[PDB]
Structure formats: C-alpha cells, structure tokens
C-alpha cells in the first residue's frame, strides 16, 4: 500500500532567529532538488516522492515556518512572512542552483523565488499550484461555500482555528483515496494546540481568487507572466477533477508554457502525492535525467 512512515532523520537550521526543520537525503554533490509543501501539510507530503529521487539526487524538504516540526512564532503567517523565511532558509543552506518540486502554497513560494532568481533554477516540477483564479465559479462546487466562509474572521476562524476543520475535514476532502489513521495523525501532530493553527487559516485568506486579495493577485500574475515566457524546464502533474487546477486548465497550461511536459496522474483532488506517488516520483526522476544538472 502507500507508505505511511516518515523515516527521515531530522535536520534543523536557524533562520531569522527561528529553527526550521528539513529533510536532507541523497548524494551530497550535484544540483539539489528542493521540495516545497503547502497547506495544511509538511515535508510528510513528500515522503513517498523523495525515495524515487534520492538514489541519484540530493533532496531537501523544509517544513514551512509555523508548520510541521519548524518553530511556530507569533506571526500573521502572511504569504510575505513565508517568503522572508524561505528566502533565508535557502541562503542558510548555502544553496546555489536548484531544481524546484513544489505544491499548493509551496508553488507560490517556489515560483516567486524562481521569478526573482531565474539564473539559479534549473527546472520546476509543480502540481496543484497557486494561480490567479478568475471567478469563484472555477472553484469546485462541492467546496465553494466552505472556502468562502474560511475567508472571514468570525466563522472562518471558528472552523479552522477552534474546530480544526481544515485538518479533520478539508484535508481528507482533498485526497481521492482514504487517508489512514496513521497518516491523519502525522498531519494532525503540528496542530494539536489551537493557537498554532494561524497558518491554516491565513493561507486560504491569501488565496488569489476573483481579484482578492489584490496584492497577492498581482504577485501571482507576475510569476505567471514569467512562467509563460521563460525557457526554464517545466513538469506539470495534474489530476481529475483537481481543486486549484481543473483538468482543462492543466491542458491549456501544458500547451502554452514553454518547455513543459504534462503528466496526467489519474484521479486526484489537491494532494496529488497522496493519490499517485509512484507515478509522480518516477516521472520526476526520469525528467531530472533529461536536464543539464
Ligand atoms: C473525515 N472527513 C471526510 C470529514 C469531511 C468533512 C468534515 C466536515 C466538513 C468539511 C467541509 C470542508 O472542509 N469543505 C471544503 C472541502 O474542500 C475540498 C478542497 O480542498 C482540498 C484541499 C485544498 C487545499 C488548498 N490550499 S489552500 O486552502 O491553502 C489555497 F488557498 F486554496 F491554496 C465542509 C463541510 C463539512 C461538514 O460536515 O459540515 C466537518 C465540519 C465541521 C466539523 N466540526 C468538528 C465542527 C467536523 C467536520 O468533519 C469532517 C470530516
Ligand atoms: Ca521548447
């Protein structure tokens, strides 16, 4: 069955006065592969992708500030906060050139960093990524009223912070196959205390949809503009019906973005790594062998 364990030794690095945890496996030389998770996950989401790549490539998978095994300071956990911390993480590890493997809010981080530092990004593998969604009619019908409620400070915080609905409900509803109790406990662990749930609520409130919030929409449009021109090698994974990326949008993107290969993973919602890790990991490994890295 799909693996439930997380066998990786913990590594920690001080970043802007805070400790961040990261996975670091694979050979020491060569261009490293930097895996960035999103909401509400951690490096745990990459646990069955990394073993396909770690035979021949260094794999680095941080836990975002406020998440996983990373420290959880009293921040607002705005996207800008995550940018500051991941900028500093990459610099703290002394990374030069990288290949990005990114998902959900990790893709916004990876795309925004790559747009700012294109000489250092030798390829981008991405899936269920942050795009400027033009209308709420593009959001999956079965989840529409709830995600609109999440974007308030009263019902939204009751649901996500007080009642933990993003972990107990939204997370399983973003995976086609059923998550085991062991897997659910791995996702629950960073967030046992309600006061640590701020990122879980701020991330859906940063989601750029129907023009709100305007500053995030502008930032995401900027990196999409870059992605539509840049020759950087691209690998897009998509599933059906998806959540952030409907299958029609994934097709359109695969045909419009330069130097892009697209892989249909089958059934999938948001956590594509939880529905077809074997294909995602094996296709990243094969694609990496075609890059000049
Ligand atoms: C076990 N089990 C399958 C479930 C399933 C459902 C529930 C529900 C429940 C949940 C929803 C609900 O979550 N609807 C929304 C689904 O959304 C799916 C698409 O997203 C997938 C992930 C996409 C992430 C994107 N990242 S991201 O946001 O940063 C950005 F920004 F997009 F990028 C809606 C209604 C209900 C309900 O039953 O009332 C509960 C509600 C309350 C509750 N109390 C204890 C009070 C417990 C619940 O127990 C459940 C367990
Ligand atoms: Ca080409």
Residue numbers in the entry: 3 to 295
Study text:
The binding mode of TMR-S5 and TMR-T5 to HaloTag7 was further studied through X-ray crystallography. The L209/I211 conformational change induced by the TMR-T5 binding in the HaloTag7 active site allows a more favorable orientation of the sulfonamide group to form hydrogen bonds with active side residues than observed for TMR-S5; while the TMR-S5 nitrogen-sulfonamide forms a 3.3 Å hydrogen bond with the catalytic D106 carboxylic acid moiety, the corresponding hydrogen bond in bound TMR-T5 is only 2.7 Å. F/F0 measured for SiR-T5 (12.6 ± 4.0) upon HaloTag7 binding was comparable to the value measured for covalently bound SiR-Halo. The loss of the interaction of the (trifluoromethyl)sulfonamide of xHTLs with D106 resulted in up to 57-fold lower affinities of dHaloTag7 for these probes compared to HaloTag7.
The specific and covalent labeling of the protein HaloTag with fluorescent probes in living cells makes it a powerful tool for bioimaging. Here, we introduce exchangeable HaloTag Ligands (xHTLs) for the reversible fluorescence labeling of HaloTag7 with rhodamines, opening up new possibilities in bioimaging for a powerful labeling tool.
